[PDB]
mmCIF file of N, CA and C in Angstrom:
data_model
loop_
_atom_site.group_PDB
_atom_site.id
_atom_site.type_symbol
_atom_site.label_atom_id
_atom_site.label_comp_id
_atom_site.label_asym_id
_atom_site.label_seq_id
_atom_site.Cartn_x
_atom_site.Cartn_y
_atom_site.Cartn_z
ATOM 1 N N UNK F 1498 127.071 49.210 284.202
ATOM 2 C CA UNK F 1498 128.142 49.134 283.193
ATOM 3 C C UNK F 1498 128.870 50.468 283.182
ATOM 4 N N UNK F 1499 130.120 50.440 282.764
ATOM 5 C CA UNK F 1499 130.932 51.652 282.654
ATOM 6 C C UNK F 1499 131.132 52.043 281.195
ATOM 7 N N UNK F 1500 131.244 53.340 280.953
ATOM 8 C CA UNK F 1500 131.629 53.861 279.641
ATOM 9 C C UNK F 1500 132.771 54.846 279.835
ATOM 10 N N UNK F 1501 133.588 54.974 278.806
ATOM 11 C CA UNK F 1501 134.693 55.919 278.732
ATOM 12 C C UNK F 1501 134.257 57.157 277.950
ATOM 13 N N UNK F 1502 134.477 58.344 278.499
ATOM 14 C CA UNK F 1502 134.285 59.587 277.729
ATOM 15 C C UNK F 1502 135.401 59.720 276.683
ATOM 16 N N UNK F 1503 134.991 59.752 275.427
ATOM 17 C CA UNK F 1503 135.927 59.954 274.308
ATOM 18 C C UNK F 1503 136.264 61.408 274.034
ATOM 19 N N UNK F 1504 135.355 62.293 274.420
ATOM 20 C CA UNK F 1504 135.483 63.747 274.273
ATOM 21 C C UNK F 1504 134.960 64.461 275.499
ATOM 22 N N UNK F 1505 135.426 65.685 275.696
ATOM 23 C CA UNK F 1505 134.760 66.605 276.608
ATOM 24 C C UNK F 1505 133.358 66.862 276.071
ATOM 25 N N UNK F 1506 132.410 67.078 276.970
ATOM 26 C CA UNK F 1506 131.061 67.461 276.586
ATOM 27 C C UNK F 1506 130.508 68.360 277.685
ATOM 28 N N UNK F 1507 130.178 69.598 277.338
ATOM 29 C CA UNK F 1507 129.559 70.510 278.276
ATOM 30 C C UNK F 1507 128.034 70.483 278.089
ATOM 31 N N UNK F 1508 127.330 70.297 279.191
ATOM 32 C CA UNK F 1508 125.882 70.279 279.194
ATOM 33 C C UNK F 1508 125.301 71.535 278.570
ATOM 34 N N UNK F 1509 124.297 71.336 277.730
ATOM 35 C CA UNK F 1509 123.641 72.417 276.985
ATOM 36 C C UNK F 1509 122.145 72.480 277.220
ATOM 37 N N UNK F 1510 121.627 71.629 278.099
ATOM 38 C CA UNK F 1510 120.219 71.676 278.478
ATOM 39 C C UNK F 1510 120.049 71.069 279.857
ATOM 40 N N UNK F 1511 118.912 71.328 280.491
ATOM 41 C CA UNK F 1511 118.709 70.898 281.876
ATOM 42 C C UNK F 1511 118.887 69.432 282.151
ATOM 43 N N UNK F 1512 118.577 68.594 281.177
ATOM 44 C CA UNK F 1512 118.669 67.145 281.353
ATOM 45 C C UNK F 1512 120.039 66.596 281.067
ATOM 46 N N UNK F 1513 120.955 67.425 280.584
ATOM 47 C CA UNK F 1513 122.297 66.949 280.234
ATOM 48 C C UNK F 1513 123.264 67.068 281.396
ATOM 49 N N UNK F 1514 124.394 66.392 281.284
ATOM 50 C CA UNK F 1514 125.474 66.517 282.252
ATOM 51 C C UNK F 1514 126.782 66.725 281.515
ATOM 52 N N UNK F 1515 127.750 67.298 282.226
ATOM 53 C CA UNK F 1515 129.083 67.567 281.714
ATOM 54 C C UNK F 1515 130.056 66.418 282.027
ATOM 55 N N UNK F 1516 130.918 66.132 281.070
ATOM 56 C CA UNK F 1516 131.995 65.155 281.252
ATOM 57 C C UNK F 1516 133.280 65.660 280.610
ATOM 58 N N UNK F 1517 134.399 65.144 281.100
ATOM 59 C CA UNK F 1517 135.717 65.390 280.520
ATOM 60 C C UNK F 1517 136.240 64.132 279.826
ATOM 61 N N UNK F 1518 136.954 64.302 278.702
ATOM 62 C CA UNK F 1518 137.645 63.195 278.046
ATOM 63 C C UNK F 1518 138.440 62.396 279.079
ATOM 64 N N UNK F 1519 138.281 61.082 279.029
ATOM 65 C CA UNK F 1519 138.985 60.185 279.926
ATOM 66 C C UNK F 1519 138.187 59.791 281.143
ATOM 67 N N UNK F 1520 137.079 60.473 281.405
ATOM 68 C CA UNK F 1520 136.242 60.157 282.569
ATOM 69 C C UNK F 1520 135.611 58.778 282.346
ATOM 70 N N UNK F 1521 135.436 58.069 283.452
ATOM 71 C CA UNK F 1521 134.773 56.781 283.469
ATOM 72 C C UNK F 1521 133.427 57.016 284.112
ATOM 73 N N UNK F 1522 132.379 56.825 283.331
ATOM 74 C CA UNK F 1522 131.016 57.139 283.741
ATOM 75 C C UNK F 1522 130.240 55.874 283.948
ATOM 76 N N UNK F 1523 129.310 55.891 284.895
ATOM 77 C CA UNK F 1523 128.372 54.786 285.035
ATOM 78 C C UNK F 1523 127.213 54.971 284.069
ATOM 79 N N UNK F 1524 126.908 53.929 283.330
ATOM 80 C CA UNK F 1524 125.838 53.969 282.334
ATOM 81 C C UNK F 1524 124.514 53.605 282.986
ATOM 82 N N UNK F 1525 123.551 54.507 282.908
ATOM 83 C CA UNK F 1525 122.243 54.347 283.556
ATOM 84 C C UNK F 1525 121.168 53.914 282.595
ATOM 85 N N UNK F 1526 121.182 54.440 281.364
ATOM 86 C CA UNK F 1526 120.130 54.123 280.397
ATOM 87 C C UNK F 1526 120.677 54.362 279.002
ATOM 88 N N UNK F 1527 120.756 53.285 278.215
ATOM 89 C CA UNK F 1527 121.225 53.349 276.838
ATOM 90 C C UNK F 1527 120.151 52.945 275.854
ATOM 91 N N UNK F 1528 118.876 53.119 276.214
ATOM 92 C CA UNK F 1528 117.782 52.743 275.318
ATOM 93 C C UNK F 1528 117.624 53.653 274.087
ATOM 94 N N UNK F 1529 118.082 54.904 274.203
ATOM 95 C CA UNK F 1529 118.050 55.846 273.092
ATOM 96 C C UNK F 1529 119.345 55.697 272.294
ATOM 97 N N UNK F 1530 119.279 55.766 270.980
ATOM 98 C CA UNK F 1530 120.503 55.530 270.196
ATOM 99 C C UNK F 1530 121.392 56.750 270.160
ATOM 100 N N UNK F 1531 120.826 57.922 270.445
ATOM 101 C CA UNK F 1531 121.561 59.178 270.346
ATOM 102 C C UNK F 1531 122.039 59.795 271.649
ATOM 103 N N UNK F 1532 121.292 59.583 272.726
ATOM 104 C CA UNK F 1532 121.556 60.204 274.046
ATOM 105 C C UNK F 1532 121.502 59.129 275.124
ATOM 106 N N UNK F 1533 122.586 58.961 275.887
ATOM 107 C CA UNK F 1533 122.681 57.987 276.967
ATOM 108 C C UNK F 1533 122.689 58.691 278.295
ATOM 109 N N UNK F 1534 121.957 58.146 279.252
ATOM 110 C CA UNK F 1534 121.941 58.681 280.589
ATOM 111 C C UNK F 1534 123.069 58.059 281.392
ATOM 112 N N UNK F 1535 123.860 58.930 282.008
ATOM 113 C CA UNK F 1535 125.085 58.532 282.699
ATOM 114 C C UNK F 1535 125.182 59.217 284.035
ATOM 115 N N UNK F 1536 126.034 58.649 284.899
ATOM 116 C CA UNK F 1536 126.395 59.225 286.178
ATOM 117 C C UNK F 1536 127.878 59.555 286.121
ATOM 118 N N UNK F 1537 128.145 60.813 286.368
ATOM 119 C CA UNK F 1537 129.472 61.424 286.381
ATOM 120 C C UNK F 1537 129.561 61.943 287.803
ATOM 121 N N UNK F 1538 130.121 61.105 288.680
ATOM 122 C CA UNK F 1538 130.196 61.359 290.120
ATOM 123 C C UNK F 1538 128.842 61.671 290.817
ATOM 124 N N UNK F 1539 128.627 62.892 291.242
ATOM 125 C CA UNK F 1539 127.471 63.173 292.071
ATOM 126 C C UNK F 1539 126.316 63.610 291.195
ATOM 127 N N UNK F 1540 126.486 63.503 289.871
ATOM 128 C CA UNK F 1540 125.503 64.027 288.937
ATOM 129 C C UNK F 1540 125.089 62.997 287.902
ATOM 130 N N UNK F 1541 123.840 63.085 287.480
ATOM 131 C CA UNK F 1541 123.281 62.250 286.421
ATOM 132 C C UNK F 1541 122.645 63.078 285.326
ATOM 133 N N UNK F 1542 122.716 62.581 284.106
ATOM 134 C CA UNK F 1542 122.041 63.221 282.991
ATOM 135 C C UNK F 1542 122.502 62.639 281.694
ATOM 136 N N UNK F 1543 122.096 63.277 280.605
ATOM 137 C CA UNK F 1543 122.325 62.782 279.264
ATOM 138 C C UNK F 1543 123.559 63.375 278.622
ATOM 139 N N UNK F 1544 124.280 62.516 277.930
ATOM 140 C CA UNK F 1544 125.384 62.898 277.026
ATOM 141 C C UNK F 1544 125.200 62.219 275.665
ATOM 142 N N UNK F 1545 125.857 62.695 274.611
ATOM 143 C CA UNK F 1545 125.717 62.028 273.323
ATOM 144 C C UNK F 1545 126.343 60.629 273.360
ATOM 145 N N UNK F 1546 125.579 59.636 272.918
ATOM 146 C CA UNK F 1546 126.022 58.253 272.892
ATOM 147 C C UNK F 1546 127.330 58.078 272.099
ATOM 148 N N UNK F 1547 127.460 58.809 271.003
ATOM 149 C CA UNK F 1547 128.647 58.718 270.185
ATOM 150 C C UNK F 1547 129.904 59.140 270.896
ATOM 151 N N UNK F 1548 129.762 59.924 271.971
ATOM 152 C CA UNK F 1548 130.910 60.496 272.670
ATOM 153 C C UNK F 1548 131.417 59.634 273.798
ATOM 154 N N UNK F 1549 130.809 58.472 273.965
ATOM 155 C CA UNK F 1549 131.275 57.537 274.992
ATOM 156 C C UNK F 1549 131.439 56.160 274.356
ATOM 157 N N UNK F 1550 132.237 55.325 275.017
ATOM 158 C CA UNK F 1550 132.526 53.978 274.577
ATOM 159 C C UNK F 1550 132.250 53.018 275.719
ATOM 160 N N UNK F 1551 131.350 52.061 275.514
ATOM 161 C CA UNK F 1551 131.158 51.003 276.498
ATOM 162 C C UNK F 1551 132.444 50.210 276.742
ATOM 163 N N UNK F 1552 132.719 49.918 278.016
ATOM 164 C CA UNK F 1552 133.935 49.181 278.386
ATOM 165 C C UNK F 1552 133.700 47.663 278.545
#
């Protein structure tokens, strides 16, 4: 599934990844209500669930 980045988000821990507003990310794991695992091109990691929108 794809999600839209609603905001920029800079990674703040080893398990996180960076995204820019408008990026289309592949959703890898949405089992946590607060942190979703996503693929942003060649990278995978967690971003805040609130900051993305399922398409």
